[PDB]
Amino acid sequence: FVKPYFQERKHLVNVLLYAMLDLPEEELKEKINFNVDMKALLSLVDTLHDSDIIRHAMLYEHILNYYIAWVPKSSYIK
Amino acid sequence: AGRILAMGIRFASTGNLKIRNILLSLVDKFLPLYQYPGKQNLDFRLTISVINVLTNVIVVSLSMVMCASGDLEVLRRVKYLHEVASGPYSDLSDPTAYLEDKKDIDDHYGKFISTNL
Amino acid sequence: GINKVLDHLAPSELIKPVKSCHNKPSVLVLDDRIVDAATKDLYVNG
């Protein structure tokens, strides 16, 4: 539902990939003519970097425990 | 095998509990011995082949009596006999080896038709 | 008694020691150039 609005805005590709690579603000300010919120940049960086998202007796038991213990537009949902 | 098969066909699709429990105990006891070529002895090998035939009858008959129910434990056991080839390979003169492999591959085919049914 | 005989017909945990068979077909030697007690048992003519 939301992508066409993103393609409506023009600088989105540049700033997002720069957010992907965590570029320093100095390189951003060299060729981008609109102010970019630094505290937003750090926050998105922090969210981006968030990462919270005997051998024969076992065969008889596991074959019972894994095969008898009955466990009751493309995928694009990774 | 003959008695339980007549037992299963008699109570076909009618459902019950005592028969199911008895078959559950029988399949639980006979399951570990299934497809176990421990001491490669033909007297043993012929006996355990009958064990394979017997355990094929018990699972079929157990499925017969509980037909169309979607039972859990009956599904639990038949899932077991479904999976894992077991047998001589894994864990638990050219035409001759062909026939030697032919016997084992045919045994797996017969073991599969029962669990599939 | 019913349970104990079924255990005799169906020994579940009693039989299987380790389940470690070699599963290869044993080959019997028929040569008559070596003299042994076992060979003499199976080979008669000498």
Side-chain angles (χ1 to χ4, degrees), chain C residues 22-40:
Chain C
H22 52 63
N23 295 305
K24 64 98 176 178
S26 81
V27 179
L28 174 58
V29 172
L30 277 296
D31 200 284
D32 60 349
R33 293 275 87 84
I34 51 171
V35 189
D36 200 358
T39 71
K40 183 51 65 203

Side-chain angles (χ1 to χ4, degrees), chain B residues 23-38 40-42 44:
Chain B
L23 270 298
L24 279 192
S25 70
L26 268 183
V27 68
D28 185 74
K29 287 167 194 52
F30 275 103
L31 205 61
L33 291 66
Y34 166 80
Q35 206 65 25
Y36 182 76
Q40 264 179 342
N41 294 348
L42 276 296
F44 173 67

Side-chain angles (χ1 to χ4, degrees), chain B residues 1-38 40-42 44-90 92 95-99 103-117:
Chain B
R3 286 170 180 284
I4 64 162
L5 169 64
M7 201 205 178
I9 299 304
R10 169 65 176 82
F11 298 153
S13 73
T14 187
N16 211 301
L17 275 299
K18 315 263 198 271
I19 297 89
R20 206 266 311 280
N21 287 125
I22 290 175
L23 270 298
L24 279 192
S25 70
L26 268 183
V27 68
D28 185 74
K29 287 167 194 52
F30 275 103
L31 205 61
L33 291 66
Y34 166 80
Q35 206 65 25
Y36 182 76
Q40 264 179 342
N41 294 348
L42 276 296
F44 173 67
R45 270 143 86 174
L46 276 296
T47 54
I48 189 166
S49 71
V50 175
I51 293 297
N52 308 128
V53 171
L54 180 61
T55 188
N56 288 305
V57 177
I58 66 176
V59 64
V60 164
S61 59
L62 172 57
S63 63
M64 295 299 102
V65 62
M66 295 299 102
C67 175
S69 79
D71 187 272
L72 273 297
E73 47 273 18
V74 181
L75 180 64
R76 290 205 216 121
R77 266 76 194 271
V78 67
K79 261 171 69 180
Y80 181 80
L81 290 167
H82 206 70
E83 294 288 324
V84 170
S86 180
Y89 291 98
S90 78
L92 196 55
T96 61
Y98 182 76
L99 266 296
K103 178 53 65 150
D104 176 46
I105 195 167
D106 291 331
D107 194 2
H108 277 89
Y109 190 50
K111 92 172 56 180
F112 291 165
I113 183 168
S114 43
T115 187
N116 290 318
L117 197 44

